[PDB]
Design a protein around this ligand. Sequence first.
Ligand SMILES: CN1c2c(nc(N)[nH]c2=O)NC[C@@H]1CNc1ccc(C(=O)N[C@@H](CCC(=O)O)C(=O)O)cc1
Ligand code: NA
Length: 282
Amino acid sequence: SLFLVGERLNATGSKRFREMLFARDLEGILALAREQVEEGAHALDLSVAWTGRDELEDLRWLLPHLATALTVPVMVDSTSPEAMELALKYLPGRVLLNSANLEDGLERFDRVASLAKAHGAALVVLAIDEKGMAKTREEKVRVALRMYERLTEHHGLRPEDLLFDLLTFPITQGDEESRPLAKETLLAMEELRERLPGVGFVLGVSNVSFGLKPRARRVLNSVFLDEARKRGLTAAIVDAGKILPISQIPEEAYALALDLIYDRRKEGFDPLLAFMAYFEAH
Ligand SMILES: CN1c2c(nc(N)[nH]c2=O)NC[C@@H]1CNc1ccc(C(=O)N[C@@H](CCC(=O)O)C(=O)O)cc1
Ligand code: NA
């Protein structure tokens, strides 16, 4: 069953965490960590990056305290290799590195992958290369295979140490480009689960619903998570306490969520509006 990675220790993603980080309210941060663990998280995503603030200084402060206080591994969420090195130095045993990609070329990808190999950390890899983010199922497969080959041949990373992130886009804007983006990821995951036995798959599930009302988001996140699980998802970055069991979602909301995820437009039926309409009326 799913390896849940709590999303909330995230300075851009959480006002609560950011204010505590800025005030050096360690006990506040530790309580938020424990909340998420109690609510189901088996690891904690940690993203302190905040524009015009020193990521390395924040991590030098917070990481030693997390190492002694936490019962679960930390997924270090950063694009700075120095920040990843801080995390690897301070944290015990399993760390997960989120993430490596190919946008900056092979050498940056290798630099991050080398860190994972050398310190026995799991590695998240994003479906992003020099041409940008893989949005269609074909693009996602192409990038993932190129990465898989580099990571196994060359770095000697094991399939089970890899978490492929095939990208979660918001399907709430309603433009043509974004409507199929959750489906493309779902279809790619199923295909790659077959092509690449033993690898993990991770998604930042909450991104799918950005812009909807909170109740609508919880439903959509929960349905998207469940659909991804059926396609082979092994880990999820989620607000662990806000994931609904499918059976708790009312019938019409559930059906509309599926219509939105799979872009099941017909004449006179826009799944996005119908989904939004539901939560206006209930
Ligand atoms: C793009 N994301 C992502 C990733 N890492 C990977 N591998 N993949 C991903 O898709 N790291 C960051 C984010 C996943 N984490 C998060 C964290 C918070 C929210 C979020 O929606 N936060 C609320 C605010 C909550 C509050 O302040 O009360 C928001 O509306 O911004 C979303 C995604
Ligand atoms: Na962030």
